[PDB]
PDB file of C-alpha atoms and ligand atoms in Angstrom:
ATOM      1  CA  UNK A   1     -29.507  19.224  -0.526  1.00 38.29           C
ATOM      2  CA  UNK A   2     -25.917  20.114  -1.985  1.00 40.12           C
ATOM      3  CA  UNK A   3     -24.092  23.336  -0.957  1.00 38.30           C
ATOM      4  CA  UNK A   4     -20.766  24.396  -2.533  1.00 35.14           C
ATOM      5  CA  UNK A   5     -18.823  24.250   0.295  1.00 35.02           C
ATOM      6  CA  UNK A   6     -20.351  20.150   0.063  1.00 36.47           C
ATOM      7  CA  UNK A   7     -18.325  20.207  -3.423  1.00 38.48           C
ATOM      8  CA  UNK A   8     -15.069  22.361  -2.710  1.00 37.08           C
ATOM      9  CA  UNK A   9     -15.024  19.385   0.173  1.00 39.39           C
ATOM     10  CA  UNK A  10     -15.132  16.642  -2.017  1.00 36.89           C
ATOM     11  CA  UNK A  11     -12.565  18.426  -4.491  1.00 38.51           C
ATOM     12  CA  UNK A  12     -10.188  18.835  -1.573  1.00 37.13           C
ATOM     13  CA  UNK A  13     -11.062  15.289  -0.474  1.00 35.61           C
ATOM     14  CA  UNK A  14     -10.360  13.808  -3.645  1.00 36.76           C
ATOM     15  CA  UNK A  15      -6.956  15.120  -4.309  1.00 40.77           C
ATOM     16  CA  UNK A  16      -5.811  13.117  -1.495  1.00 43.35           C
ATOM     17  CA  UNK A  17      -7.726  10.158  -3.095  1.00 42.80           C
ATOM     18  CA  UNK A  18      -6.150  10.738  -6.424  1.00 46.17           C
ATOM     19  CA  UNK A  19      -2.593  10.217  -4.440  1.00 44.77           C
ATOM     20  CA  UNK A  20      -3.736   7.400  -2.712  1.00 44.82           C
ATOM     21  CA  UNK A  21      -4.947   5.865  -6.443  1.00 42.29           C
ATOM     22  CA  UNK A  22      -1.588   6.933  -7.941  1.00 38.00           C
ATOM     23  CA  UNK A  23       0.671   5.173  -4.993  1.00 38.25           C
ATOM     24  CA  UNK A  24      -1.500   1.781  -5.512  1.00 37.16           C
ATOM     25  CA  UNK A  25      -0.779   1.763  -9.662  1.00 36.52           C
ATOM     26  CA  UNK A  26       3.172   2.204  -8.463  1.00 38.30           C
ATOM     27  CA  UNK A  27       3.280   6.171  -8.193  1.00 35.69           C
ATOM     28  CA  UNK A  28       4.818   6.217 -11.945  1.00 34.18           C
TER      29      UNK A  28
ATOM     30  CA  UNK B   1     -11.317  16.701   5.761  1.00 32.24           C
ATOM     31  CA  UNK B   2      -7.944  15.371   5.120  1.00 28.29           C
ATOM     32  CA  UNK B   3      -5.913  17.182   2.673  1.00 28.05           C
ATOM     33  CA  UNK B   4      -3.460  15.713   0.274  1.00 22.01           C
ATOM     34  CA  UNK B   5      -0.614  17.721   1.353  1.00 24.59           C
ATOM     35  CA  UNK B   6      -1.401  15.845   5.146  1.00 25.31           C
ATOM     36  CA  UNK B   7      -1.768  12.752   3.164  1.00 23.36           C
ATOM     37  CA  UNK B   8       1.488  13.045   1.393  1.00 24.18           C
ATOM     38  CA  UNK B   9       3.502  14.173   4.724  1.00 25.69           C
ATOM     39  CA  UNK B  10       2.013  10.540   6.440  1.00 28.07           C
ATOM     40  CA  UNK B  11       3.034   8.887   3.412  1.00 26.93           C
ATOM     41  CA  UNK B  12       6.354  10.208   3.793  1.00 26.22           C
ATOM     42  CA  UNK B  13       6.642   8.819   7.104  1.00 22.85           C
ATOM     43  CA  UNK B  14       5.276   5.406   6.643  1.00 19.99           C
ATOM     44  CA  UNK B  15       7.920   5.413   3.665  1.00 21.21           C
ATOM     45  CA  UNK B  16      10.964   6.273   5.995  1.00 17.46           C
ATOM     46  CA  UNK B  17       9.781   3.552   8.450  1.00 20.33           C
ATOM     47  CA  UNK B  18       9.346   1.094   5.868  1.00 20.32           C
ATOM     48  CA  UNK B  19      12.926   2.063   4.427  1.00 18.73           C
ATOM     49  CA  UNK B  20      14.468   1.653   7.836  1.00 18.45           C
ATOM     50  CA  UNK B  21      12.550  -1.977   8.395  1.00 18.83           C
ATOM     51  CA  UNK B  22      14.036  -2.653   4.973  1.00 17.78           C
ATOM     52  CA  UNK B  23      17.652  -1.898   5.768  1.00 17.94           C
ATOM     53  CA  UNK B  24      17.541  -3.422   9.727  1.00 18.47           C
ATOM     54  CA  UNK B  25      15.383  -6.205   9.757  1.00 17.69           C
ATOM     55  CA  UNK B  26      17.602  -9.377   9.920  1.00 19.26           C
ATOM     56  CA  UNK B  27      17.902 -11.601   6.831  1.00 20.19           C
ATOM     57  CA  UNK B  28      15.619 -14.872   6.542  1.00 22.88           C
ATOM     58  CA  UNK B  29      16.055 -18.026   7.285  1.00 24.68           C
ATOM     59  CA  UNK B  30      16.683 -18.925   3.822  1.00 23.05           C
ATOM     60  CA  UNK B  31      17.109 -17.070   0.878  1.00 23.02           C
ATOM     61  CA  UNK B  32      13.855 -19.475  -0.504  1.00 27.93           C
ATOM     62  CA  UNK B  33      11.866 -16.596   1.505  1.00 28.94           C
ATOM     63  CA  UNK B  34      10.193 -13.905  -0.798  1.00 27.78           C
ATOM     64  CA  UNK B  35      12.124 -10.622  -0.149  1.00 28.49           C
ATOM     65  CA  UNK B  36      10.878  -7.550   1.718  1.00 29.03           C
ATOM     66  CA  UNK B  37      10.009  -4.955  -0.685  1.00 28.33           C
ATOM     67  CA  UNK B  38       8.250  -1.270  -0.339  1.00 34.20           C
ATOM     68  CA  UNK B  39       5.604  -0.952  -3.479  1.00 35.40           C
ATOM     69  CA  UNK B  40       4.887   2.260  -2.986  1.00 35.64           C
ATOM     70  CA  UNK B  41       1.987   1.356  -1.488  1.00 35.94           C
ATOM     71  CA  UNK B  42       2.604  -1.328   1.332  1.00 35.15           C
ATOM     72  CA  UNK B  43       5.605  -2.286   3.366  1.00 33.10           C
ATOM     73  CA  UNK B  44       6.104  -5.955   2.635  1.00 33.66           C
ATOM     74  CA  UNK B  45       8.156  -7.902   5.050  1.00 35.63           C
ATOM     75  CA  UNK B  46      10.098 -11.080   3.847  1.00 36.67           C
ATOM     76  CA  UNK B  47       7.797 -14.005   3.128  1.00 37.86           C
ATOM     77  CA  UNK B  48       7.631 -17.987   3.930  1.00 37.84           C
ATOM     78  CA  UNK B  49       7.344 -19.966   0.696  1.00 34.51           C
ATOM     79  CA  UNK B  50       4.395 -21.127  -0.080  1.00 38.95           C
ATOM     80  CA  UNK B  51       2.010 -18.840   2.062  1.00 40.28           C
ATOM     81  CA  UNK B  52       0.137 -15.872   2.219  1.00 42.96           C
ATOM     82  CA  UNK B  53       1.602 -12.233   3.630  1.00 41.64           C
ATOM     83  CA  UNK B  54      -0.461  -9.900   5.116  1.00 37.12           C
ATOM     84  CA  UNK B  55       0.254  -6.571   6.226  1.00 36.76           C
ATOM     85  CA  UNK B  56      -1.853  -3.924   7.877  1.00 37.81           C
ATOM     86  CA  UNK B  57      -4.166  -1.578   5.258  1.00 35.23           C
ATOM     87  CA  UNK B  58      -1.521   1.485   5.386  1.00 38.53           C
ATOM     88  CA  UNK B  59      -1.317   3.973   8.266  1.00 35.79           C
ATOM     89  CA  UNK B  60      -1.554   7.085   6.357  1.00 31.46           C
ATOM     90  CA  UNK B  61      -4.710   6.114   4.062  1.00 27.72           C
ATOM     91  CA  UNK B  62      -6.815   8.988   4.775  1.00 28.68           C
ATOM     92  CA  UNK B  63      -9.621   6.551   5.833  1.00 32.95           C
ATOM     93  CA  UNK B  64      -7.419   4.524   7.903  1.00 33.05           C
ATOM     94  CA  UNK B  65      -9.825   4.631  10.665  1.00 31.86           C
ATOM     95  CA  UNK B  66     -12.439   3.230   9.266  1.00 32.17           C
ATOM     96  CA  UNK B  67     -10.171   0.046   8.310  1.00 30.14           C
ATOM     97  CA  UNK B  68      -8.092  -0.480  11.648  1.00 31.35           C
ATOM     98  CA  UNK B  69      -8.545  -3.988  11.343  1.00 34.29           C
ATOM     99  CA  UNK B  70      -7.761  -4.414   7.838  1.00 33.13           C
ATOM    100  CA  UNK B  71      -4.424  -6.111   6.038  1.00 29.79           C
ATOM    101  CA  UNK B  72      -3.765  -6.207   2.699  1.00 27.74           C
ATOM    102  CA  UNK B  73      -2.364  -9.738   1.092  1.00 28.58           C
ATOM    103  CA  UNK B  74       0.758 -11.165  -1.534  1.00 27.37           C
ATOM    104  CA  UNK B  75       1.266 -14.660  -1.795  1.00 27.87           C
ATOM    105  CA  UNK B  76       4.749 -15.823  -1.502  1.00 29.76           C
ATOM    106  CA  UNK B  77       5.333 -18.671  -3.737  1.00 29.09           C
ATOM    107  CA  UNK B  78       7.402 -21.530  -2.855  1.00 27.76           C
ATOM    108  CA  UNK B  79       9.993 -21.102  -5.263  1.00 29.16           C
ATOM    109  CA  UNK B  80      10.805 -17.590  -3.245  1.00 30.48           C
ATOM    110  CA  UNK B  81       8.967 -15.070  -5.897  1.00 29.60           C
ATOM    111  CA  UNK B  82       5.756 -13.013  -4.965  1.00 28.50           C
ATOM    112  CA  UNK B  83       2.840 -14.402  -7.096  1.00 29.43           C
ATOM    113  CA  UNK B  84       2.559 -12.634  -9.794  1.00 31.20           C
ATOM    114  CA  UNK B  85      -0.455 -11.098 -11.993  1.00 31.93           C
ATOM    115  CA  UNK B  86      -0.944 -12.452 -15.737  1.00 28.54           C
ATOM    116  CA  UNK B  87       0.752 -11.042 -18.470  1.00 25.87           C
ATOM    117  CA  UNK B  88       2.999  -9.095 -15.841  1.00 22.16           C
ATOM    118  CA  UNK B  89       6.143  -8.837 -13.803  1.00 20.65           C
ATOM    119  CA  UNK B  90       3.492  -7.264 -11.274  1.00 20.64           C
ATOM    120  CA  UNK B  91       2.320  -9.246  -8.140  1.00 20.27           C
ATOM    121  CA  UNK B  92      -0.629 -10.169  -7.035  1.00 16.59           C
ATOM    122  CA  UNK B  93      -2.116  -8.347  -4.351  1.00 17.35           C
ATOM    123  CA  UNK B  94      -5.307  -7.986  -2.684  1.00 12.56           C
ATOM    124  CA  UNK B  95      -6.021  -4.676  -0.962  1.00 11.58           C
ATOM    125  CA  UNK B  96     -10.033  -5.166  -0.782  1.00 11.47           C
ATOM    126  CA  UNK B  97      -9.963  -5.093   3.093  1.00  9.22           C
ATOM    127  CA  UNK B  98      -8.395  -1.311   2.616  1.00 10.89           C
ATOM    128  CA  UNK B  99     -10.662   0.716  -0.054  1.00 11.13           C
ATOM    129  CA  UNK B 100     -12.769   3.251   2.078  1.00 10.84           C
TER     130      UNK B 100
HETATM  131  C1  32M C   1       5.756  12.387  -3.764  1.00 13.42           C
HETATM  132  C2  32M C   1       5.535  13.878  -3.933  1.00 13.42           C
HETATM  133  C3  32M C   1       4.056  14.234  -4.078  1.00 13.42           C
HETATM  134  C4  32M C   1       3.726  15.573  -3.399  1.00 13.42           C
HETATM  135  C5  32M C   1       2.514  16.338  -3.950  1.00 13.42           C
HETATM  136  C6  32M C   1       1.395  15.410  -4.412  1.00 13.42           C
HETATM  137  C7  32M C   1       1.396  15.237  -5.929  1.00 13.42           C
HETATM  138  C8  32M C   1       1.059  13.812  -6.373  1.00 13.42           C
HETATM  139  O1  32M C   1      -0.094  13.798  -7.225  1.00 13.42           O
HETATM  140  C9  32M C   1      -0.083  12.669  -8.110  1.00 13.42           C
HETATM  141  C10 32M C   1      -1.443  12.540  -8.773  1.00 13.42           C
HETATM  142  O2  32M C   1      -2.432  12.878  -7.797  1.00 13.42           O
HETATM  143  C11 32M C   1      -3.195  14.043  -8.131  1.00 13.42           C
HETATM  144  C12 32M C   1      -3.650  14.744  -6.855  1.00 13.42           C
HETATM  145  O3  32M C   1      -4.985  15.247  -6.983  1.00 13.42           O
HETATM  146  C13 32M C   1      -5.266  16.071  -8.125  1.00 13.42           C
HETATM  147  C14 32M C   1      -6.290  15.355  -9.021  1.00 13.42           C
HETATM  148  O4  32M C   1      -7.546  16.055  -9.024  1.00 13.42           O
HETATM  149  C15 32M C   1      -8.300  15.878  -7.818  1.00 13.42           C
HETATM  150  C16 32M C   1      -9.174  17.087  -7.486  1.00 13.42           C
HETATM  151  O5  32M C   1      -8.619  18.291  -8.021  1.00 13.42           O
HETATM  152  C17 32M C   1      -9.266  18.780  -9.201  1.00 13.42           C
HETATM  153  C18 32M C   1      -8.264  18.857 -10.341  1.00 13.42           C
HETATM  154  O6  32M C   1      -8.964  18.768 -11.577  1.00 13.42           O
HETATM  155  C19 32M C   1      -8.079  18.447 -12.641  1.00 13.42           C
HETATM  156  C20 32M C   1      -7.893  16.942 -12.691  1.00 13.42           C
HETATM  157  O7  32M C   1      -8.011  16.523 -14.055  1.00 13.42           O
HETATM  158  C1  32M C   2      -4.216 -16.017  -5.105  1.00 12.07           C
HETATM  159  C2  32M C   2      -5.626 -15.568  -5.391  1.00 12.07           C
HETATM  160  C3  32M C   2      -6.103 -16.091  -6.732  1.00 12.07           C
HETATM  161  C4  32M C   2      -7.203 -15.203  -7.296  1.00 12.07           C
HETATM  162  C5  32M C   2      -7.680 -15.731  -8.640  1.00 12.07           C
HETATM  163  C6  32M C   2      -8.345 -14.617  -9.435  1.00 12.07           C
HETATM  164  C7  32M C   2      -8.998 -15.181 -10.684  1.00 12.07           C
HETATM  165  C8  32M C   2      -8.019 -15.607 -11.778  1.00 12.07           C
HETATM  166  O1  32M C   2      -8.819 -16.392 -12.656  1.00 12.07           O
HETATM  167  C9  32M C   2      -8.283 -16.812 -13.916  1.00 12.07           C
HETATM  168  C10 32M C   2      -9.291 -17.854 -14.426  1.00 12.07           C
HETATM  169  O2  32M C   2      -8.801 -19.204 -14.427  1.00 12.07           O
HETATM  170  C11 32M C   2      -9.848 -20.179 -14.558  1.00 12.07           C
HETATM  171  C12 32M C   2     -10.574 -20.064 -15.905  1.00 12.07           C
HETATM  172  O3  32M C   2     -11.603 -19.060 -15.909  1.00 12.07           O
HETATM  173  C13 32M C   2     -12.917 -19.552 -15.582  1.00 12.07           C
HETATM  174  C14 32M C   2     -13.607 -20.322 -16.731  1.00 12.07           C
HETATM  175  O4  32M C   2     -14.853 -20.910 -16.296  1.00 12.07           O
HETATM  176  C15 32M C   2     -16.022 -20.607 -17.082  1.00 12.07           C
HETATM  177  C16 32M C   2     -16.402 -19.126 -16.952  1.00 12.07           C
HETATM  178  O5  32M C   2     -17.779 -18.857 -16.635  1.00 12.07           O
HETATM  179  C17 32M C   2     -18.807 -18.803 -17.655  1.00 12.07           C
HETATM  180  C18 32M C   2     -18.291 -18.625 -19.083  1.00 12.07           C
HETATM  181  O6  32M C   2     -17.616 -19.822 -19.479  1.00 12.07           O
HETATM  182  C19 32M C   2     -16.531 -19.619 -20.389  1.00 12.07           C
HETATM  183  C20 32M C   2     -15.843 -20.956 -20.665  1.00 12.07           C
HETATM  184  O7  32M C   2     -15.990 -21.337 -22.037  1.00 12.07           O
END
């Protein structure tokens, strides 16, 4: 199953995703 | 896992490389070339007319490894101006060999 460690992970993980999104609309 | 603030550092990097390609590279053959551009994103070198640009999927994409072999595409047309996206001053690019 899911722990919370599993879900501050993905939070963590996604920040960096959110960056990555933001840089390929033109980081405006 | 990778963080954003090690995400943002590699960015930063890739972003001063890019800048010094931008400023050193030498000029084109002709100025009917698409010109080098950084787009945030990707560092775009000049372009023939009338072909396709690829670049490697970015070094500091947190999933890089898992797309080593990947590039990500513009299209230079042959009048010397990336293609562009409908209804846009935007160009076209395809980055589907790059999403984790
Ligand atoms: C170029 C300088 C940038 C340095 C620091 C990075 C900031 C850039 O961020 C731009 C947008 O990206 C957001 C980063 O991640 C935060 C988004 O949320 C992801 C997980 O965190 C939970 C936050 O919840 C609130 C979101 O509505
Ligand atoms: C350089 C890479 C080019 C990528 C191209 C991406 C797609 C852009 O497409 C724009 C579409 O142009 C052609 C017209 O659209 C297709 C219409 O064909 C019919 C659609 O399928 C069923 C519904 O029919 C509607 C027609 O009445």
């Amino acid at each position: 199953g899911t722990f919370t460690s599993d879900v501050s992970s993905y939070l963590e993980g996604q920040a960096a995703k959110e960056f990555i999104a933001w840089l390929v609309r033109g980081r405006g | 896992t990778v963080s954003l603030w090690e995400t943002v550092q590699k960015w930063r990097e890739y972003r001063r490389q890019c800048q010094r390609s931008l400023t050193e590279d030498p000029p084109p053959a002709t100025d009917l070339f698409c010109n080098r551009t950084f787009d945030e994103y990707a560092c775009w070198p000049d372009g023939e007319p009338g072909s396709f640009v690829n670049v490697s999927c970015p070094w500091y994409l947190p999933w890089a490894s898992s797309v080593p072999q990947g590039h990500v595409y513009r299209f230079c047309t042959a009048e010397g101006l990336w293609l562009q996206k409908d209804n846009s001053s935007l160009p076209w690019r395809d980055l589907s060999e790059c999403e984790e």
